[model samples]
Target: EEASSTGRNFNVEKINGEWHTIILASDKREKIEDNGNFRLFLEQIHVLENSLVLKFHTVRDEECSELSMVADKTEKAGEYSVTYDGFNTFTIPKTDYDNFLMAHLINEKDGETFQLMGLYGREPDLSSDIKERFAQLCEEHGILRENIIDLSNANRC
Candidate 1:
């Protein structure tokens, strides 16, 4: 795994084999020198039958990249990664014929119980209007639009 300060750095790897460099976030976003939200976000995370996009979180006092995840995304008490231990990373197994669904994350943040459940994977349709509305869902809920590719690749891997 390689880390770079400029452009897109790192590739997607799974189970010791790498497919493509799942570009979760574009390097152009901004350098995260301190604590902040991960630039990569997913609008809606869903998969076909047997497909799963494992979720994880990482925290860094330094440059804790959400890249080159050396640890397993799903392990040890269902916390996505050890880096963000206690942060919930759920595995949503694909179900059948749904326009939307949810990926839930249960957490008690800042002393308030906040639960995150994602409405994802719209069924393919012909109307462009539906797609526009789907984009609206992303904006409303602040989903990770950038990480779709990485999420998809991760599922495939």
Candidate 2:
């Protein structure tokens, strides 16, 4: 009986309209030093209607490996509510979006954002490929960032 299986489940899926995929490998392999082989969250945002909502769900697979510290498996990802009208909580406007991203992500964590070339290392400009990608898709989903985390105040610091 070589037949049916439920298929292997994946932990991630991009929301409709726009999304991004990140390669989850050891930081060392991706040039991260000191962090070692611990699992890291490299996320891509799906900006829908000038706003993006973060959602995650996980399965109870293991009792060990401390999934709680890393996994966000809940209907409501965290304390933050969906402020639809005021998408400033969910979305970032063209002018303020870059700065908001800068503040949301720590200096080292958001190294990917700063990697884009600039005239004098100033604010993010959409002239380059990376920033251009973000600008092109900020209004939708399936945009790739390639590093780091912490844009929402839902983390337990």
Candidate 3:
């Protein structure tokens, strides 16, 4: 299997701002399915001295619930770790700062492992070329195209 590459010369300042979830995928379908734990809608990203603060939300019981997380930066440029539903290692494998970003997440919970990939854009919608790039990246991480879901048209709170 091929390993995903990490972003080069990652600039934390450039990534701080409002972002929208354009697409999401996972090797385990349920993880990105309706009301899945991994189906999070991103709102804003705050860069700190040694960690990143991710503000996002999820829909539960037909209500929009807000959530936030702190990811501690690792030695790697684009890698961070967070403890949520499990121990998660998040990586920004690719991004253009101004346009879009692709993130890979690996979660370990109760001796089980799950992987999720997400595409985020500065706006709610992105160009077709960006979507294609996200799809290609997901495939590289072992997430099939069939598992990907486009959320550009989905309701957000």
Candidate 4:
């Protein structure tokens, strides 16, 4: 695990108003730095029959990364529920999925939430509804709405 700001303070907030890219605001750096693990934003999400396959990139040297996590399509407590315990997953709900989907994953253990990766749409901007829902969901997980930098160029890490 590597702190996102490590290696070289890669400008993850390089939103040039071209593609939908959301990076964990620098404030959240302390959270991951506290543990030496980093967060990665998904470049693509493959919604399978019962799970989501995600892909991302490592800032250093620009390498591709991928992971798979099972999703609970069952009855969720709400749009803001912590569906699973360890190794969990959640989505933005059917309320917004016009051409792309927004979702994330977190793994909780004795007490820590690890590895937050989001599969947001590549479109330049997200619908206000989805934006609000995403912020609400993120806040439920302790992420401040202001702490998320939105609409990136989808390049420059």
lDDT of each: 0.31, 0.23, 0.85, 0.42
Error of model 4, residue 106, in angstroms: 3.9
Single out the weakest 10-residue window by summed lDDT for candidate 1: 10-19
Strongest candidate by lDDT: 3
Top-TM-score structure, candidate number = 3
Clashing pairs in 3: none
> Residue 4 lDDT in model 3?
31
Give the residue spans of candidate 4 off by over 4 A: 1-20, 23-38, 61-86, 93-95, 114-119, 124-142, 154-157
lDDT of 3 by residue, 7-105 (tens): 344577888899999999998988888878898999999989999899999988668889999999878767899998889998877777787878888
Q: Model 1, which residues run further than 4 Å from truth?
A: 1-40, 43-86, 89-94, 97-101, 109-112, 122-157
In candidate 4, what are the lDDT values of residues 33-147, reduced to their tens digit? 3232344444554444434344444343445454333343445432122334444544343222333344454555677655443425556455666567666766766677555
TM-scores for every predicted model? 0.27, 0.19, 0.91, 0.48
lDDT tens digits by residue: candidate 2, 28-141: 233221232222222333434433443322212221222211222223221122321121111111122222121111112323321110111112122344344333442243
Candidate 2 stretches with Cα past 4 Å from truth are 1-22, 29-46, 57-157
**Candidates 3 and 4, the one with greater TM-score:** 3
Q: Write the per-residue lDDT of candidate 1 for residues 8-120, one digit (tens) a residue.
A: 43112221121222122222123111243433223222222323343433345323334332223453332242233244344322112233222334444455433343323
